[PDB]
Amino acid sequence: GPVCAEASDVYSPCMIASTPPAPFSDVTAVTFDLINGKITPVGDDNWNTHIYNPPIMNVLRTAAWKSGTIHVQLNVRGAGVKRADWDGQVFVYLRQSMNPESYDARTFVISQPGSAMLNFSFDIIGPNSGFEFAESPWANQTTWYLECVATNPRQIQQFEVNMRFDPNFRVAGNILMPPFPLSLKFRFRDIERSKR
Amino acid sequence: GPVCAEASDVYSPCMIASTPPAPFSDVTAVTFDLINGKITPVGDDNWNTHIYNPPIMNVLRTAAWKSGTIHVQLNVRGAGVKRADWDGQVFVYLRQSMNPESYDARTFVISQPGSAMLNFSFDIIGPNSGFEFAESPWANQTTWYLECVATNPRQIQQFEVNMRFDPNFRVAGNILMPPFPLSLKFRFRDIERSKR
Amino acid sequence: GPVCAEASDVYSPCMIASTPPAPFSDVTAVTFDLINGKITPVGDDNWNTHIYNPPIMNVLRTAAWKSGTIHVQLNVRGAGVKRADWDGQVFVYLRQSMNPESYDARTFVISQPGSAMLNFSFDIIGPNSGFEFAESPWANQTTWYLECVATNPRQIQQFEVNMRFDPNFRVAGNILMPPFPLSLKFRFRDIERSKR
Amino acid sequence: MEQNLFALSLDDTSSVRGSLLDTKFAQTRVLLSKAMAGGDVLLDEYLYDVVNGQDFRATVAFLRTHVITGKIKVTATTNISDNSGCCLMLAINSGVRGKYSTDVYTICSQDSMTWNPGCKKNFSFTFNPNPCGDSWSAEMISRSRVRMTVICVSGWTLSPTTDVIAKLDWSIVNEKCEPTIYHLADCQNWLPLNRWMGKLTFPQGVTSEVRRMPLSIGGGAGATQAFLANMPNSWISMWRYFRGELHFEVTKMSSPYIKATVTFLIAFGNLSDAFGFYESFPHRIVQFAEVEEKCTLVFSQQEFVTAWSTQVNPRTTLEADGCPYLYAIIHDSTTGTISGDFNLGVKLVGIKDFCGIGSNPGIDGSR
Amino acid sequence: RMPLSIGGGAGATQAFLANMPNSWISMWRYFRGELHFEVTKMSSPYIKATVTFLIAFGNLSDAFGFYESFPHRIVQFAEVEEKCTLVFSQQEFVTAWSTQVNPRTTLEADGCPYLYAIIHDSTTGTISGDFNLGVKLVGIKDFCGIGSNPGIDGSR
Amino acid sequence: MEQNLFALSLDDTSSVRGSLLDTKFAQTRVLLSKAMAGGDVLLDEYLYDVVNGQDFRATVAFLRTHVITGKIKVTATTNISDNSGCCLMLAINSGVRGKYSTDVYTICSQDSMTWNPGCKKNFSFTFNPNPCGDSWSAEMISRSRVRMTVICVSGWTLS
């Protein structure tokens, strides 16, 4: 409709993936490993990827064993492209594994002009009393990847995966990670830096 | 769909921010400090900002300590622009702080042609028995800002932040404010003034 | 989405307001006094207004003291205008008073091409045991007006305010009204009259 | 001796109270012209303007008491010889709007006394000027602009020698102000209406006079290219179909000297005039004595098979109309030693055990 | 006269002043309750005056010498007393009244109650000086707030 | 509905009664000049002329009640700083005769309040305007010509 339903809780932005710059016109894709926080673009396409460090992500990277629902919100921007000239589609795919043999756990298909939003959820669940160690050889446990495909990277400028734990979420165990490094005008700070 | 869900309660308009006039074409942004009622546009862009004085806003400006949910409705107008020529996007961002290090608490992304609406909510909650003094040095409490970005200010003419207290809302303490000053054709009064 | 939610009850059409005919291109507006059933267009613009006489309206005109929720459905038509050439927006505003000092109780903002619908509600409530006499000097009671603005009257041909009492609605007292007079091809009867 | 003035009883917020002498607050002097006609405004002023230039015991109490829990009694002393008679109606409405109709239909609705001076020496009735609360004030009704209207619904059947005066005498009794609120429940034990079904003139003679009044009451009463509306009648038309025990209140408006016996019955429109078997149907005979001017016909649920529509299309003829009518048939002959019609006023007081079905999208006119 | 449409702040030049509690009550459209004023003497004990307080509407003129027809409270202050608590029960008001009125509305056309303060006799003293007197609505007991004020800009 | 008018309670002969708000029938505005002397008539009028041009709750009751069993209370709100003081005397007498004396001596006799505004914030006193009976009326005191007199027996010690 026109009158929209009310958004609510705090979702923190975890992984941005800007699309390769001009003149690159071909179809391209990217994969967000939602648990381990990794962004692997297809082939040798120079996507500009950043993994931010909100509390969600630091927990997801450091927690060994995880359990329960995480709500995702994939936002898509957004080039200065006349609406009648828009031909960009965004196909996304939840997957357990990245291997050819595995099927998708969910497919979404978006062709909103300019910009778009897609809220979904998925529950991490595993063998060890409902807990899953992501990509552990034990019990051949697996991650959740989020494959995303831009049919037109000139029009789709960037993806943006925001996440939120459902209240039921639970972790256990620590992982020794390396030191986490610190951190287009779609932003208030970035508009100031282009005139200074 | 076409058949829309029923809107309801009284939301009062708090902060309008008209976009800079012609020939200014570049990307621009504005920040609404939702609690303290302040509108800081980016750099030296002459946005035309007004903070109105409905009961909500006068309470939000005078109350010291606040607690509970406030429902926002960000409306966007709206130039006389052919729909096929529309390329304007609106990115909004809830934030606690305006500093570079802080992350967003919510991102929305709108590319409706002409005009748009975006209802969301957020709960003020703080250390002092669930109450938050906005921007107090005590316990490094922080506001809620609403950063908004217009990719095309020729098409997006103005923002408009309407608000409503949820029934759970509660204040305490008074603040000594200075005297509150009093108060494009998107209006019945403004249409009369352009032919008189 | 594409699959739409199910509409239901009987809403009766109360007030139509057709937009001024060609060559009038300027921005214009109209105000529907929702209780007293009056349609005042802005300035000297010859809008073609009709107030129909369904049971709702006759009750709203004759009842003195009123209480409870009324559901409105503002429909907008609708010219034969190519969708890519569409630039018409519709801004609506609930208000208590028509005076400059009063603020809005609700703002909606629609830019659907061709035609549109907007369901909302509002509760009449007043001092006299929850009853409100519309525009009575007693306790400075006030109406509900519905200001509506067409940015492009060549494209937006007419407004149409349908209403329905919620089950909780209650009236008391009679008002002596004068005799109620009796009663573009957007209609089955009107198509027959243009070929006869 | 000195005393503490803050402790005194000068904050007496109590209502106006006492005997009928010391609750009187105004008298008003209505002139009934020697030759007055039907549908004729005798008085029409705001209820607060009654008390302008008055000096009775409760007049200053009435204006200065912030709250009043009691009803307003109005009594009208007016009489005329048995030989003649007419029908006056005093009526209170919660307000007006520009160039309002003063037809008996429109007015009746809310709070009204109707009487025949020929039969009743005097007539009184109480009312609550705020119909959605237990209380009111002089400042409420002045600014709310409550409107009082006296109207003559039937002229003098025999004119008096000179002009007449009806003295209205406004007091405040100590009855509870009960509120009268209409609401959208489908089943209601008592839905009041005070719907003016119409004035029935029957000329003097030997002709078979029949008068039909349709019970598809909704959608107002007629006018030129218009219709009149009360609130209660607009309220019942919210529903598509309806039924209940109908409580009519038939009133004699002529003199006692014009005599006629009237059969009342429910039946459908198809029945012709010059059909002389109306008393096959169940019916009630109504003779009026000299003193009686008022009688209450009730038509139970057993007179109706189903509910019937609140509105019918105005174009539908009597031949093709499946809702019931209320017939009023002269049983014998209208008579009298003096010339004049046998006027008779029927007023649907209300529907008992009202059952409203559906949701009327509506029809424009009336009949 | 002091208006009981208290909401929407107090006035200034092209502005208004606001507390939180007064901005809070204006959340609601109409309201009512027992009003607990606290009238305070600010002058010396030597300036003497008797003050009638009453609820009534704006239409009542000055040089209308029948204010004591209405219910009222007389307030004499002794030398030692500087403070007294006027209370106006629910029986002084028929209905609720609006928290805000348009600033343009005149006294002649304004249907909310006022609180009058009328000098009963005459202000006196052997020393020169006004009889200053401060009224402060302490609070509303049995407060009942109705509706939802969309708002009005000014004060009065 | 009709009713028998002879049976109604319009022959209520009862006296004026109730709270002090609804028994009030007049106020009167006496001017004490900045420099008033002793033996100085401030007010002097017939007690019935008090109620001329009055519109309080019991004013029309007072004029129209044929009998009144109750006393008349009069109360005088008048105060002045402790620094000063004077002596006023309000006084009611059953009548007068041509060019009467208004010396405190003459006046006092029958029914009088005397007070010092300097000390008393206000002063009240009741009285019976018919001194040889248990009852009276507005018509009795108008035609009997009962006379009320306020006099200043001592001037302001400090103006």
PDB file of N, CA, C and O in Angstrom, chain D residues 34-61:
ATOM      1  N   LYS D  34     -55.985  34.868  16.430  1.00  0.00           N
ATOM      2  CA  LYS D  34     -57.378  34.479  16.193  1.00  0.00           C
ATOM      3  C   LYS D  34     -57.514  33.526  15.006  1.00  0.00           C
ATOM      4  O   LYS D  34     -58.265  32.550  15.074  1.00  0.00           O
ATOM      5  N   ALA D  35     -56.785  33.822  13.930  1.00  0.00           N
ATOM      6  CA  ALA D  35     -56.751  32.983  12.736  1.00  0.00           C
ATOM      7  C   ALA D  35     -55.322  32.508  12.437  1.00  0.00           C
ATOM      8  O   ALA D  35     -54.657  33.035  11.541  1.00  0.00           O
ATOM      9  N   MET D  36     -54.863  31.515  13.202  1.00  0.00           N
ATOM     10  CA  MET D  36     -53.568  30.861  12.962  1.00  0.00           C
ATOM     11  C   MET D  36     -53.762  29.580  12.154  1.00  0.00           C
ATOM     12  O   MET D  36     -54.741  28.852  12.344  1.00  0.00           O
ATOM     13  N   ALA D  37     -52.804  29.314  11.268  1.00  0.00           N
ATOM     14  CA  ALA D  37     -52.816  28.142  10.394  1.00  0.00           C
ATOM     15  C   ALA D  37     -51.864  27.058  10.906  1.00  0.00           C
ATOM     16  O   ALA D  37     -51.144  27.253  11.888  1.00  0.00           O
ATOM     17  N   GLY D  38     -51.878  25.912  10.230  1.00  0.00           N
ATOM     18  CA  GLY D  38     -50.947  24.823  10.511  1.00  0.00           C
ATOM     19  C   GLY D  38     -49.554  25.150  10.013  1.00  0.00           C
ATOM     20  O   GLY D  38     -49.396  25.943   9.082  1.00  0.00           O
ATOM     21  N   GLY D  39     -48.548  24.535  10.640  1.00  0.00           N
ATOM     22  CA  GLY D  39     -47.129  24.771  10.326  1.00  0.00           C
ATOM     23  C   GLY D  39     -46.752  26.236  10.453  1.00  0.00           C
ATOM     24  O   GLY D  39     -46.289  26.848   9.487  1.00  0.00           O
ATOM     25  N   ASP D  40     -46.956  26.788  11.647  1.00  0.00           N
ATOM     26  CA  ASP D  40     -46.917  28.229  11.857  1.00  0.00           C
ATOM     27  C   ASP D  40     -46.183  28.567  13.154  1.00  0.00           C
ATOM     28  O   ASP D  40     -46.717  28.349  14.240  1.00  0.00           O
ATOM     29  N   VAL D  41     -44.956  29.079  13.034  1.00  0.00           N
ATOM     30  CA  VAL D  41     -44.134  29.428  14.208  1.00  0.00           C
ATOM     31  C   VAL D  41     -44.758  30.534  15.044  1.00  0.00           C
ATOM     32  O   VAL D  41     -44.941  31.661  14.586  1.00  0.00           O
ATOM     33  N   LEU D  42     -45.095  30.179  16.275  1.00  0.00           N
ATOM     34  CA  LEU D  42     -45.676  31.105  17.227  1.00  0.00           C
ATOM     35  C   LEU D  42     -44.569  31.752  18.034  1.00  0.00           C
ATOM     36  O   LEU D  42     -44.522  32.971  18.174  1.00  0.00           O
ATOM     37  N   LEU D  43     -43.685  30.919  18.563  1.00  0.00           N
ATOM     38  CA  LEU D  43     -42.470  31.370  19.204  1.00  0.00           C
ATOM     39  C   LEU D  43     -41.301  30.586  18.649  1.00  0.00           C
ATOM     40  O   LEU D  43     -41.436  29.414  18.304  1.00  0.00           O
ATOM     41  N   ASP D  44     -40.156  31.247  18.556  1.00  0.00           N
ATOM     42  CA  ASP D  44     -38.917  30.605  18.157  1.00  0.00           C
ATOM     43  C   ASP D  44     -37.763  31.468  18.650  1.00  0.00           C
ATOM     44  O   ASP D  44     -37.430  32.477  18.027  1.00  0.00           O
ATOM     45  N   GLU D  45     -37.192  31.087  19.789  1.00  0.00           N
ATOM     46  CA  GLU D  45     -36.044  31.782  20.365  1.00  0.00           C
ATOM     47  C   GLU D  45     -35.118  30.808  21.059  1.00  0.00           C
ATOM     48  O   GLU D  45     -35.510  29.687  21.373  1.00  0.00           O
ATOM     49  N   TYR D  46     -33.894  31.253  21.325  1.00  0.00           N
ATOM     50  CA  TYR D  46     -32.946  30.456  22.100  1.00  0.00           C
ATOM     51  C   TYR D  46     -33.455  30.317  23.527  1.00  0.00           C
ATOM     52  O   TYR D  46     -34.009  31.260  24.086  1.00  0.00           O
ATOM     53  N   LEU D  47     -33.265  29.140  24.107  1.00  0.00           N
ATOM     54  CA  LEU D  47     -33.748  28.843  25.456  1.00  0.00           C
ATOM     55  C   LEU D  47     -33.176  29.766  26.533  1.00  0.00           C
ATOM     56  O   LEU D  47     -33.817  29.976  27.552  1.00  0.00           O
ATOM     57  N   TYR D  48     -31.971  30.293  26.332  1.00  0.00           N
ATOM     58  CA  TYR D  48     -31.393  31.268  27.259  1.00  0.00           C
ATOM     59  C   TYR D  48     -32.087  32.633  27.183  1.00  0.00           C
ATOM     60  O   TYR D  48     -32.191  33.320  28.191  1.00  0.00           O
ATOM     61  N   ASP D  49     -32.565  33.022  26.002  1.00  0.00           N
ATOM     62  CA  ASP D  49     -33.271  34.304  25.831  1.00  0.00           C
ATOM     63  C   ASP D  49     -34.667  34.335  26.469  1.00  0.00           C
ATOM     64  O   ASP D  49     -35.308  35.386  26.504  1.00  0.00           O
ATOM     65  N   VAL D  50     -35.150  33.183  26.929  1.00  0.00           N
ATOM     66  CA  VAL D  50     -36.349  33.110  27.768  1.00  0.00           C
ATOM     67  C   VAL D  50     -36.181  33.950  29.021  1.00  0.00           C
ATOM     68  O   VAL D  50     -37.083  34.693  29.394  1.00  0.00           O
ATOM     69  N   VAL D  51     -35.014  33.832  29.647  1.00  0.00           N
ATOM     70  CA  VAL D  51     -34.752  34.435  30.949  1.00  0.00           C
ATOM     71  C   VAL D  51     -34.312  35.915  30.892  1.00  0.00           C
ATOM     72  O   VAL D  51     -34.005  36.496  31.927  1.00  0.00           O
ATOM     73  N   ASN D  52     -34.276  36.519  29.703  1.00  0.00           N
ATOM     74  CA  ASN D  52     -33.930  37.938  29.567  1.00  0.00           C
ATOM     75  C   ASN D  52     -35.051  38.835  30.082  1.00  0.00           C
ATOM     76  O   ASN D  52     -36.197  38.725  29.632  1.00  0.00           O
ATOM     77  N   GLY D  53     -34.703  39.716  31.023  1.00  0.00           N
ATOM     78  CA  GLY D  53     -35.646  40.657  31.619  1.00  0.00           C
ATOM     79  C   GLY D  53     -36.631  39.980  32.548  1.00  0.00           C
ATOM     80  O   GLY D  53     -37.831  40.246  32.481  1.00  0.00           O
ATOM     81  N   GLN D  54     -36.116  39.105  33.411  1.00  0.00           N
ATOM     82  CA  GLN D  54     -36.946  38.346  34.345  1.00  0.00           C
ATOM     83  C   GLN D  54     -36.484  38.533  35.779  1.00  0.00           C
ATOM     84  O   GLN D  54     -35.301  38.771  36.042  1.00  0.00           O
ATOM     85  N   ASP D  55     -37.440  38.404  36.698  1.00  0.00           N
ATOM     86  CA  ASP D  55     -37.259  38.808  38.085  1.00  0.00           C
ATOM     87  C   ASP D  55     -38.134  37.944  38.995  1.00  0.00           C
ATOM     88  O   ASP D  55     -38.923  38.446  39.795  1.00  0.00           O
ATOM     89  N   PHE D  56     -37.982  36.633  38.846  1.00  0.00           N
ATOM     90  CA  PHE D  56     -38.617  35.646  39.721  1.00  0.00           C
ATOM     91  C   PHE D  56     -37.585  35.120  40.713  1.00  0.00           C
ATOM     92  O   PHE D  56     -36.410  35.503  40.657  1.00  0.00           O
ATOM     93  N   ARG D  57     -38.014  34.255  41.624  1.00  0.00           N
ATOM     94  CA  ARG D  57     -37.179  33.914  42.772  1.00  0.00           C
ATOM     95  C   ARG D  57     -35.902  33.155  42.430  1.00  0.00           C
ATOM     96  O   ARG D  57     -34.865  33.378  43.049  1.00  0.00           O
ATOM     97  N   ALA D  58     -35.973  32.278  41.444  1.00  0.00           N
ATOM     98  CA  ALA D  58     -34.819  31.478  41.056  1.00  0.00           C
ATOM     99  C   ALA D  58     -34.113  31.998  39.813  1.00  0.00           C
ATOM    100  O   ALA D  58     -33.323  31.275  39.238  1.00  0.00           O
ATOM    101  N   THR D  59     -34.388  33.226  39.394  1.00  0.00           N
ATOM    102  CA  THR D  59     -33.810  33.748  38.167  1.00  0.00           C
ATOM    103  C   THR D  59     -32.327  34.036  38.325  1.00  0.00           C
ATOM    104  O   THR D  59     -31.530  33.662  37.471  1.00  0.00           O
ATOM    105  N   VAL D  60     -31.961  34.706  39.407  1.00  0.00           N
ATOM    106  CA  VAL D  60     -30.561  34.984  39.698  1.00  0.00           C
ATOM    107  C   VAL D  60     -29.842  33.723  40.158  1.00  0.00           C
ATOM    108  O   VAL D  60     -28.669  33.566  39.872  1.00  0.00           O
ATOM    109  N   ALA D  61     -30.524  32.817  40.847  1.00  0.00           N
ATOM    110  CA  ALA D  61     -29.916  31.512  41.154  1.00  0.00           C
ATOM    111  C   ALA D  61     -29.595  30.714  39.883  1.00  0.00           C
ATOM    112  O   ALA D  61     -28.547  30.104  39.788  1.00  0.00           O
TER     113      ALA D  61
END
